[PDB]
Amino acid sequence: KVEDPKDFPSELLSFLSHAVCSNRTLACFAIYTTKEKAALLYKKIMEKYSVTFISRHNSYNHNILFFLTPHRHRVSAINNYAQKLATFSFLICKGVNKEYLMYSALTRDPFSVIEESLPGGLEHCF
């Protein structure tokens, strides 16, 4: 087994906040985790946080979840909910600073959409 990723793919890092322990609240987040755990979290996060939009993407044999929330949350709050579900699988949760650029990159090589909550993906959300 290859070592689990320690961060998001290098292509995406500019779009993220790396201050994961901040008290700052945000309304856009991304999670890097296994294919199995991302599939589960897609449904769980959709309901828990009443997402405006959520999408799940292929990323280097893992998955990335991307979502927008109608209320603001600390990144650590999302992490707390998600690590509990991911159990013994790697999981990286970060806030997204550049919402449109992040989502756009996740829809194009080397990434691709697996499923998302709005048809035609987004476009009124950006």
Author numbering: 131 to 252, 254 to 257
Sentences reproduced from the published study:
The modular multifunctional protein large T antigen (T-ag) from simian virus 40 orchestrates many of the events needed for replication of the viral double-stranded DNA genome. This protein assembles into single and double hexamers on specific DNA sequences located at the origin of replication. T-ag contains three structurally and functionally independent domains: an N-terminal J domain followed by the origin-binding domain (OBD) and the helicase domain. The T-ag OBD has multiple functions; it binds the GAGGC sequences in the origin of replication in a sequence-specific manner.
When the wt T-ag OBD structure was analyzed via the program SSBOND, we identified only one pair as candidates for mutation: Phe151 and Asp256. Therefore, to eliminate disulfide formation with Cys216, we also mutated Cys216 to alanine (Cys216Ala). Finally, using a vector encoding a double mutant of T-ag OBD (pGEX T-ag OBDC216A, F151C), we generated a vector encoding the triple-mutant form T-ag OBDF151C, C216A, D256C (termed 3XM). However, under oxidizing conditions 3XM forms higher order complexes (dimers, trimers etc.) as analyzed by SDS–PAGE. To verify that the desired intermolecular disulfide bond formed between Phe151Cys and Asp256Cys, we crystallized the triple mutant and subjected the crystals to X-ray analysis. The triple mutant crystallized in the same space group (P65) and has almost identical unit-cell parameters as the wt T-ag OBD. The final model contains amino acids 131–252 and 254–257, 127 water molecules and one citrate molecule. Nonetheless, the electron density for the disulfide bond connecting the protomers is clear. Despite the indicated changes, the backbones of the two structures are virtually identical. Finally, although the triple mutant has reorganized a portion of the protein–protein interface, the disulfide cross-link, together with the other protein–protein interactions, are sufficient for formation of the crystallographic hexamer.
